[PDB]
Design a binder for these strands. Structure first.
Ligand SMILES: NC[C@@H]1O[C@H](O[C@H]2[C@@H](O)[C@H](O[C@@H]3[C@@H](O)[C@H](N)C[C@H](N)[C@H]3O[C@H]3O[C@H](CO)[C@@H](O)[C@H](O)[C@H]3N)O[C@@H]2CO)[C@H](N)[C@@H](O)[C@@H]1O
Ligand SMILES: [Mg+2]
Ligand SMILES: [Mg+2]
Ligand SMILES: [Mg+2]
Ligand SMILES: [Mg+2]
Ligand SMILES: [Mg+2]
Ligand SMILES: [Mg+2]
Ligand SMILES: [Mg+2]
Ligand SMILES: [Mg+2]
Ligand SMILES: [Mg+2]
Ligand SMILES: [Mg+2]
Ligand SMILES: [Mg+2]
Ligand SMILES: [Mg+2]
Ligand SMILES: [Mg+2]
Ligand SMILES: [Mg+2]
Ligand SMILES: [Mg+2]
Ligand SMILES: [Mg+2]
Ligand SMILES: [Mg+2]
Ligand SMILES: [Mg+2]
Ligand SMILES: [Mg+2]
Ligand SMILES: [Mg+2]
Ligand SMILES: [Mg+2]
Ligand SMILES: [Mg+2]
Ligand SMILES: [Mg+2]
Ligand SMILES: [Mg+2]
Ligand SMILES: [Mg+2]
Ligand SMILES: [Mg+2]
Ligand SMILES: [Mg+2]
Ligand SMILES: [Mg+2]
Ligand SMILES: [Mg+2]
Ligand SMILES: [Mg+2]
Ligand SMILES: [Mg+2]
Ligand SMILES: [Mg+2]
Ligand SMILES: [Mg+2]
Ligand SMILES: [Mg+2]
Ligand SMILES: [Mg+2]
Ligand SMILES: [Mg+2]
Ligand SMILES: [Mg+2]
Ligand SMILES: [Mg+2]
Ligand SMILES: [Mg+2]
Ligand SMILES: [Mg+2]
Ligand SMILES: [Mg+2]
Ligand SMILES: [Mg+2]
Ligand SMILES: [Mg+2]
Ligand SMILES: [Mg+2]
Ligand SMILES: [Mg+2]
Ligand SMILES: [Mg+2]
Ligand SMILES: [Mg+2]
Ligand SMILES: [Mg+2]
Ligand SMILES: [Mg+2]
Ligand SMILES: [Mg+2]
Ligand SMILES: [Mg+2]
Ligand SMILES: [Mg+2]
Ligand SMILES: [Mg+2]
Ligand SMILES: [Mg+2]
Ligand SMILES: [Mg+2]
Ligand SMILES: [Mg+2]
Ligand SMILES: [Mg+2]
Ligand SMILES: [Mg+2]
Ligand SMILES: [Mg+2]
Ligand SMILES: [Mg+2]
Ligand SMILES: [Mg+2]
Ligand SMILES: [Mg+2]
Ligand SMILES: [Mg+2]
Ligand SMILES: [Mg+2]
Ligand SMILES: [Mg+2]
Ligand SMILES: [Mg+2]
Ligand SMILES: [Mg+2]
Ligand SMILES: [Mg+2]
Ligand SMILES: [Mg+2]
Ligand SMILES: [Mg+2]
Ligand SMILES: [Mg+2]
Ligand SMILES: [Mg+2]
Ligand SMILES: [Mg+2]
Ligand SMILES: [Mg+2]
Ligand SMILES: [Mg+2]
Ligand SMILES: [Mg+2]
Ligand SMILES: [Mg+2]
Ligand SMILES: [Mg+2]
Ligand SMILES: [Mg+2]
Ligand SMILES: [Mg+2]
Ligand SMILES: [Mg+2]
Ligand SMILES: [Mg+2]
Ligand SMILES: [Mg+2]
Ligand SMILES: [Mg+2]
Ligand SMILES: [Mg+2]
Ligand SMILES: [Mg+2]
Ligand SMILES: [Mg+2]
Ligand SMILES: [Mg+2]
Ligand SMILES: [Mg+2]
Ligand SMILES: [Mg+2]
Ligand SMILES: [Mg+2]
Ligand SMILES: [Mg+2]
Ligand SMILES: [Mg+2]
Ligand SMILES: [Mg+2]
Ligand SMILES: [Mg+2]
Ligand SMILES: [Mg+2]
Ligand SMILES: [Mg+2]
Ligand SMILES: [Mg+2]
Ligand SMILES: [Mg+2]
Ligand SMILES: [Mg+2]
Ligand SMILES: [Mg+2]
Ligand SMILES: [Mg+2]
Ligand SMILES: [Mg+2]
Ligand SMILES: [Mg+2]
Ligand SMILES: [Mg+2]
Ligand SMILES: [Mg+2]
Ligand SMILES: [Mg+2]
Ligand SMILES: [Mg+2]
Ligand SMILES: [Mg+2]
Ligand SMILES: [Mg+2]
Ligand SMILES: [Mg+2]
Ligand SMILES: [Mg+2]
Ligand SMILES: [Mg+2]
Ligand SMILES: [Mg+2]
Ligand SMILES: [Mg+2]
Ligand SMILES: [Mg+2]
Ligand SMILES: [Mg+2]
Ligand SMILES: [Mg+2]
Ligand SMILES: [Mg+2]
Ligand SMILES: [Mg+2]
Ligand SMILES: [Mg+2]
Ligand SMILES: [Mg+2]
Ligand SMILES: [Mg+2]
Ligand SMILES: [Mg+2]
Ligand SMILES: [Mg+2]
Ligand SMILES: [Mg+2]
Ligand SMILES: [Mg+2]
Ligand SMILES: [Mg+2]
Ligand SMILES: [Mg+2]
Ligand SMILES: [Mg+2]
Lengths: 272, 49, 9
RNA sequence: CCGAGGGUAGGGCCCGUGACUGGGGCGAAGUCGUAACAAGGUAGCUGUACCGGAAGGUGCGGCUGGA
RNA sequence: CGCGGGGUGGAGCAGCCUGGUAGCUCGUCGGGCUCAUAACCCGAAGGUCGUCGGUUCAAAUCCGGCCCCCGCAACCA
RNA sequence: AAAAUGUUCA
RNA sequence: UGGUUCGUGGAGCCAUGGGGGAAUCUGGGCGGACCACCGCCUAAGGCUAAGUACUCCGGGUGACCGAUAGCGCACCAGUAC
RNA sequence: GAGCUAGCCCUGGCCAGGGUGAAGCUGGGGUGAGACCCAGUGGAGGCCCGAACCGGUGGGGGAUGCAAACCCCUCGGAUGA
RNA sequence: GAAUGCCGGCAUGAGUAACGAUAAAGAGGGUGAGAAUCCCUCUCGCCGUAAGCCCAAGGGUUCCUACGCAAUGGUCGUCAGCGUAGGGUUAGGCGGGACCUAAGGUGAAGCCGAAAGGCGUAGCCGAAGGGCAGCCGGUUAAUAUUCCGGCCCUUCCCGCAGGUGCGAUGGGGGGACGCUCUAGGCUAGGGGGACCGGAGCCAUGGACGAGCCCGGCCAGAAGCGCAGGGUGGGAGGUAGGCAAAUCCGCCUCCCAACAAGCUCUGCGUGGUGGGGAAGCCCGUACGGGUGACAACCCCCCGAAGCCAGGGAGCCAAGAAAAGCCUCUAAGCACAACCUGCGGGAACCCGUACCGCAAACCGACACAGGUGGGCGGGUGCAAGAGCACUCAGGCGCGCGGGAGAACCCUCGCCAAGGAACUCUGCAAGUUGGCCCCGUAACUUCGGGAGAAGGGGUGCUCCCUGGGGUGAUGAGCCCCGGGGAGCCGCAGUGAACAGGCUCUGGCGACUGUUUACCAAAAACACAGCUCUCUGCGAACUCGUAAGAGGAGGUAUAGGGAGCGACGCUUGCCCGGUGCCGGAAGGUCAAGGGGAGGGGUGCAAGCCCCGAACCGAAGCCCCGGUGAACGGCGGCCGUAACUAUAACGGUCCUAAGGUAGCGAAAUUCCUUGUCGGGUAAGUUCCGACCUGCACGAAAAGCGUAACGACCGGAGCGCUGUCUCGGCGAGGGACCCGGUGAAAUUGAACUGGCCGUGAAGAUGCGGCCUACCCGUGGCAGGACGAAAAGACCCCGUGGAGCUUUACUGCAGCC
RNA sequence: CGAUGUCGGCUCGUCGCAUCCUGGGGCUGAAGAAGGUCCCAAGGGUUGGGCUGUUCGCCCAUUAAAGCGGCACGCGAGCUG
């Protein structure tokens, strides 16, 4: 839906906030299962190695369930859907009859009170997790494992999915959010449905501060700098570059393919 | 204005203390040099309890 | 002193 | 007290005027091209969109005031 | 002032560096086709090559001096 | 298959 | 590739990182590419005084200084600052 | 050497008093149901005035200064990057 | 004898500048060898969201006291923060540690690295964060939540008395958290009082009065009382909480849905304890006595503080661990644990004093810097603002005279109002609140405090709402209406926008050159391009490792543009990037035609042609929101003029829209038009654009601006054009007393001359010796071995299709 | 070049005359008035604005006239910037 504001201030005239109506009466989270201390820090042991990180709201990590094959066969009741500061998506709090409480990343269409479960069994319904094989060709799916028993790694961003395209002996072909065509092992779990919160892309930050709230420090142009700092630094009053556009570290930034050629992963990929 | 000396007993101790110098080869040599020199004070005297 | 002023005037 | 009126400030409607600019009307025999009327030599017209010295061209849908 | 590029039939351009041979398009002229014009077709004419010098057996062509034309430069005070 | 034009008034 | 006077030089010898990979005296390395001949040695295990270097320390001497010199310090100096 | 300074991390503190009056609520109106409109409530904001506080715009003084960046008048922000 | 030489010493300027805020001093009396400066009294001024109190950091004897003045004090000094000596810092409850965990540090296992070393889950360390039991008075010259007095708590250990399956570093719960706004009841704090208590006081015209003045509390266990915070009670089933659980979690039936009940705080009350003014009398360098049997009560305002883990709303979604409760396991249940009561035990370090400053950071008794808490009263709408003033603390460690110039800081001015000037720079006008009233434009919010105005004090009368009180008196808040009074003037003092029109740039709040640039630079939301399938790309590190990210294409890295609106054209030849299992070239290596050297020979040893040989380059395509680029010359229309139209050469293609003398326009003050008496500027136009132009974006855009330009009104000392006055200096006297500089000096003008700008040489002229206050023409004045410039086969930063390497990648 | 601060403005001036005005004079194609030109003469005087950093210049309103130069394109230990 997206919340919109009137221009009672500049920067409030474009600004735009998510709709939280799917956030069920459960705004503060769940101890026990999560949260952990989350360790803010824009850099490695010592030095900054990703520029322009820092500031922005304190967070608690929700330790979510990315391998659903523990509770094969054990169903769970979806108890709530809550805000997760550390991902684009929303998260489902679910209660297993087992007693155990996990969070699942919350798919589009998930309703509270719903039944959900994981395993070879598993009715093909939104919320359920299955090894890729038993899932019908053509159904859209998410939180897909890359290699079996290694955890969900594909399609967890808000409003993303992959679609099952066909099969090939032990592998089923996937069409990933990027549009790539991937052979992913049959035995990999993946949960049916799309991610949801799909209006995430429609949000307009609206002002500088908002950027900072999310811990995004000001990014400065190479043009703004000096020859010591950047290939684009200097010279006089503005300058068009004077070389093929580059990163600060000298590599070209328009076109230069960067995936290494001889990756053994290659023989499992069929697209862009 | 604000000058450059902003005394702190903990800082002076953690920074220039006998135990800091002892911790690394760089520092151990400092004690060696100061000893051979005949320095009355190997490290700065940080006070208080 | 140590300068550090540049030769202006 | 009110008060003709004068003063100060700020709006509204109308008239006149202005370097320049826009298209228009009209003025026998100036220029360029051929759009339309015959199937006008690409049927025409059309709303819209883009483009082109100019009529105009073309895309999409429509019409018979054409086959 | 300095630099380097150019004047070739009526118009716009080749031809030079490896000297002896001036060609292309348009235009012009004569003839056709058309009722007539253009378009189109067949023929033809037209160049002291900016000048002054000489280098050579021979100069559009190579070398000097002027004459216009075009472009670049004139910085630090 | 391609083919433009015909000064003004009677 | 390093070492040797040897800077690829005709470049050996001595070390070695990589690859291949023997032999036990009729076996093996060397005498400056290489081959022959003639000779010198016996690798891939280790220990070994003395002669040599040095002067914190003790002593002796001086065509060494004599308090701006001689060590930074002749004096409670690596102090005061 | 980051006790100045730059950034980030962890944990605390601070921001007088005034204004302006968004969403949303409640009532009324309207409609087939709506959209929407009126109040009333509400208290939003890199919102406004303005101390503390953080600054350093303009001018004057200062120039072996009170001061190796100060002082006077004036001025920017002041619930947020 | 020289090196702007080095060390030291002493001169010069010089009794000159200065003596550190313009908050301010006068006098009497002491003490003393000696007093503007020390002690005391009186008078005066200054601070009072401090220039007053209390901590933290830091400082380390500065604290108190005795005796002292050589030096330190910008003067003096009998004084001191200085010298000599002595004295002073008391804790189970405050803080820190025998408690906990955060970032981070360290680090067993383990991984890595030529060595030194680097990483690293557990654990440990690590603190104004979590946890934790003292409040109020009294004493010292100097310490007190520490000693003492009263009242009240905390742990251990050993006992008795009784309760129960007790019981782990293990499980679970709790602890436990954001921002903004907030309700109810309290306390701190404050105002008032005809009531209570007090020494006193009638002055100078009047007042013996419900008169003036001063003061009317604090702490306090249990139990209450009032606020409020926490929390459902059962019974079954159970596969999860990494062993086990009765616990928790998940189901299913009952009763509650209430704070009824359990507890937990806060506040009142409380056995009792303590305090207790003005004034007067005393002797202090200060404290004491009395006032006292002191009284110790009633209203009112009221928090940002307490009840606290309260409530509501919002998005950016808001530490951990232990104490604490509980569950069980090994063990053991003559243990052990819990409740109650007794006795006993309760360590280590800090405590002085400064603490917005003369004791900390600035070489100084330095006008600067320095974190937290309290910060009273009145009035001005409020308030931590502003003026004065409680308490408290100061008059800033040189003074005394004088009444010049000139400077600083400030007040006022005839008439004119910007004529000043690069510019209204500066200074003035305006100014608070309440109420009328407000334009273009606009993204519908704004522009708005538009602009422009009126009201503002005091007296009396009438009157409407609340709040606390019972539905009332009072006390406290908002109002309305009507008469009237005075002054030049009613936010009468102090704090408090000048306004408008129109361009340029940037959307905007923001950020920036600490120490000359705050902007149109940077950033910014947003747009696009590109990279990246996750052991991601990218980055740091030799590596291990880590960031990215405990993220996963709505994600992350790089680049450009920089809200928004309308848009962003043509060129892929060159350069870059992307795509091409062909072809050309291609290094090691494979391959050996064949040749060479030695050998009597088998052999040993050299070279070495075909051919097989990757990437890269070539080559073939693609690609401009990739690096970039986007023409010239002639002719032509029935007045001329101009050229829709034509020819031609060249290119990879020959700048479209929109804009244009521009932050771009050289010729240039282009030419018209506007504003002005007059306008190299400014605005609007024309287009001949030296040399605009579409994401190094193009043209516009409401709002916004310590940005830049133009104009106008208002208003002025900016000016015409100055004048007067104030104080701080200057000046004189007493005291203390520098500096840069300096070859030496007995240092005149002119005209000449001289290395070409003479006090010093020549000629003439003028001029008794020496100071003080001033002015700056000169001593090519001072200060810095010229920053410009050039030189040196001097040095650095940067660049690239300069050379040669290296990382990285292939 | 071990430093001579470099434009213009303000301020304060002073000097040369090859004079802008005023005084005196010759010639005039000088009727008069008003001009033209040359000689003598510097004693004194030589405005205020708009524009521009400007010097200069162009303008507006005047005037007896709106003089020209030198003095380190006079004058920054005088100011401005
Ligand atoms: N008046 C007609 C409107 O204006 C235009 O028409 C104007 C012109 O286009 C037109 O020009 C014509 C031209 O078309 C035609 N081929 C040649 C003719 N000689 C011209 O004529 C014009 O110019 C001449 C002067 O020389 C005048 O005398 C005459 O009046 C005038 N019509 O003359 C018209 C003025 O009267 C549009 N073309 C027409 O379609 C429109 O409806
Ligand atoms: Mg926890
Ligand atoms: Mg690192
Ligand atoms: Mg480290
Ligand atoms: Mg940027
Ligand atoms: Mg820059
Ligand atoms: Mg660079
Ligand atoms: Mg440029
Ligand atoms: Mg560049
Ligand atoms: Mg009009
Ligand atoms: Mg036709
Ligand atoms: Mg047709
Ligand atoms: Mg047609
Ligand atoms: Mg159409
Ligand atoms: Mg077309
Ligand atoms: Mg220069
Ligand atoms: Mg025709
Ligand atoms: Mg006809
Ligand atoms: Mg006729
Ligand atoms: Mg060698
Ligand atoms: Mg060998
Ligand atoms: Mg040998
Ligand atoms: Mg030999
Ligand atoms: Mg041998
Ligand atoms: Mg001797
Ligand atoms: Mg001697
Ligand atoms: Mg010595
Ligand atoms: Mg010595
Ligand atoms: Mg409302
Ligand atoms: Mg508000
Ligand atoms: Mg604000
Ligand atoms: Mg403000
Ligand atoms: Mg700053
Ligand atoms: Mg000599
Ligand atoms: Mg000197
Ligand atoms: Mg000396
Ligand atoms: Mg003097
Ligand atoms: Mg003097
Ligand atoms: Mg003096
Ligand atoms: Mg003083
Ligand atoms: Mg005495
Ligand atoms: Mg006062
Ligand atoms: Mg002492
Ligand atoms: Mg003392
Ligand atoms: Mg003294
Ligand atoms: Mg002093
Ligand atoms: Mg004494
Ligand atoms: Mg003392
Ligand atoms: Mg404690
Ligand atoms: Mg102990
Ligand atoms: Mg610990
Ligand atoms: Mg840790
Ligand atoms: Mg470590
Ligand atoms: Mg500890
Ligand atoms: Mg604590
Ligand atoms: Mg138990
Ligand atoms: Mg626990
Ligand atoms: Mg009387
Ligand atoms: Mg009590
Ligand atoms: Mg279990
Ligand atoms: Mg008493
Ligand atoms: Mg709450
Ligand atoms: Mg622990
Ligand atoms: Mg436990
Ligand atoms: Mg104490
Ligand atoms: Mg104390
Ligand atoms: Mg004390
Ligand atoms: Mg303070
Ligand atoms: Mg002082
Ligand atoms: Mg001070
Ligand atoms: Mg402060
Ligand atoms: Mg207060
Ligand atoms: Mg007020
Ligand atoms: Mg104040
Ligand atoms: Mg006046
Ligand atoms: Mg007047
Ligand atoms: Mg006026
Ligand atoms: Mg003017
Ligand atoms: Mg003027
Ligand atoms: Mg101006
Ligand atoms: Mg001003
Ligand atoms: Mg403006
Ligand atoms: Mg503007
Ligand atoms: Mg801006
Ligand atoms: Mg700003
Ligand atoms: Mg600066
Ligand atoms: Mg500045
Ligand atoms: Mg600014
Ligand atoms: Mg990683
Ligand atoms: Mg991570
Ligand atoms: Mg990206
Ligand atoms: Mg930009
Ligand atoms: Mg920009
Ligand atoms: Mg821009
Ligand atoms: Mg191509
Ligand atoms: Mg190209
Ligand atoms: Mg290309
Ligand atoms: Mg390629
Ligand atoms: Mg190849
Ligand atoms: Mg483009
Ligand atoms: Mg123009
Ligand atoms: Mg330009
Ligand atoms: Mg004009
Ligand atoms: Mg004009
Ligand atoms: Mg441009
Ligand atoms: Mg561009
Ligand atoms: Mg004046
Ligand atoms: Mg005075
Ligand atoms: Mg004196
Ligand atoms: Mg003399
Ligand atoms: Mg001379
Ligand atoms: Mg002489
Ligand atoms: Mg002389
Ligand atoms: Mg002088
Ligand atoms: Mg000098
Ligand atoms: Mg020099
Ligand atoms: Mg050289
Ligand atoms: Mg050198
Ligand atoms: Mg020089
Ligand atoms: Mg000199
Ligand atoms: Mg004369
Ligand atoms: Mg005459
Ligand atoms: Mg003007
Ligand atoms: Mg001007
Ligand atoms: Mg000049
Ligand atoms: Mg003169
Ligand atoms: Mg000159
Ligand atoms: Mg000059
Ligand atoms: Mg100056
Ligand atoms: Mg001078
Ligand atoms: Mg300037």
């Amino acid at each position: 839906a997206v919340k919109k504001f009137k221009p009672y201030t500049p920067s409030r005239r474009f600004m735009t906030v998510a709709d939280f109506s799917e956030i069920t009466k459960t705004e503060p989270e769940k101890s026990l299962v999560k949260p952990l201390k989350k360790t803010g820090g824009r850099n490695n042991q010592g030095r900054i190695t990703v520029r322009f990180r820092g500031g922005g709201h304190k967070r608690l990590y929700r330790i979510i369930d990315f391998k659903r094959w523990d509770k094969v066969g054990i169903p769970a009741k979806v108890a709530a859907i809550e805000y997760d500061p550390n991902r684009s998506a929303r998260i489902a709090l679910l209660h297993y009859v087992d007693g155990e409480k996990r969070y699942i990343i919350a798919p589009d269409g998930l309703q509270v009170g719903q039944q959900v479960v994981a395993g070879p069994d598993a009715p093909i319904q939104v919320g359920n997790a299955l090894p890729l094989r038993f899932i019908p060709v053509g159904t859209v799916v998410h939180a897909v494992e890359l290699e079996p028993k290694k955890g969900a790694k594909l399609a967890r961003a808000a409003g993303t999915s992959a679609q099952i395209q066909g099969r090939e002996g032990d592998y089923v072909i996937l069409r990933l959010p990027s549009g790539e065509l991937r052979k992913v092992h049959g035995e990999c779990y993946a949960t049916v449905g799309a991610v949801g919160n799909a209006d995430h892309k429609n949000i307009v930050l609206g002002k500088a501060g908002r950027s900072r709230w999310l811990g995004r420090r000001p990014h400065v142009r190479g043009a703004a700098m000096n020859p010591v700092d950047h290939p684009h630094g200097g010279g006089e009053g503005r300058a068009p570059r004077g070389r093929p556009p580059a990163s600060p570290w000298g590599w070209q930034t328009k076109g230069l393919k960067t995936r290494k050629r001889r990756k053994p992963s290659s023989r499992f990929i069929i697209a862009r | 204005m604000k000058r450059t000396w902003q005394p702190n007993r903990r800082k002076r101790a953690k920074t220039h203390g006998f135990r800091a110098r002892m911790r690394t080869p760089g520092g151990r040599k400092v004690l060696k040099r100061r000893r051979q020199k005949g320095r009355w004070r190997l490290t700065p005297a940080v006070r208080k309890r | 002193x140590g300068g550090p002023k540049k030769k202006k005037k």
